[PDB]
């Protein structure tokens, strides 16, 4: 059960830091 | 304790995917 | 273990907050966009 947690938390701190980064370049117009 | 952290993980499981939704429409129209 | 879980869900609520405000300000134009 915590195990299966753990790979839950992996795979949301992964979509998180994706994520960031579009909505960062999006904020900043970048490119 | 576990059950709890169950409960949050689903909760944010849930908003990142809107979250991921809307980003992309963002990205387009 | 799990105390470790508990403190990367905790940062995960606060950076996942942060996301959803960001999205609705680009979402809405709000303070011009």
Known sequence: ???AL??????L???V???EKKV???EH???
């Open 29 to 31: 117009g970048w490119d």
């Open 24 to 26: 960062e370049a999006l």
């Open 6 to 11: 753990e790979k839950k938390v992996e795979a």
């Open 17 to 19: 830091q994706k994520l």
């Open 1 to 3: 059960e915590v195990e």
């Open 13 to 15: 701190e992964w979509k």
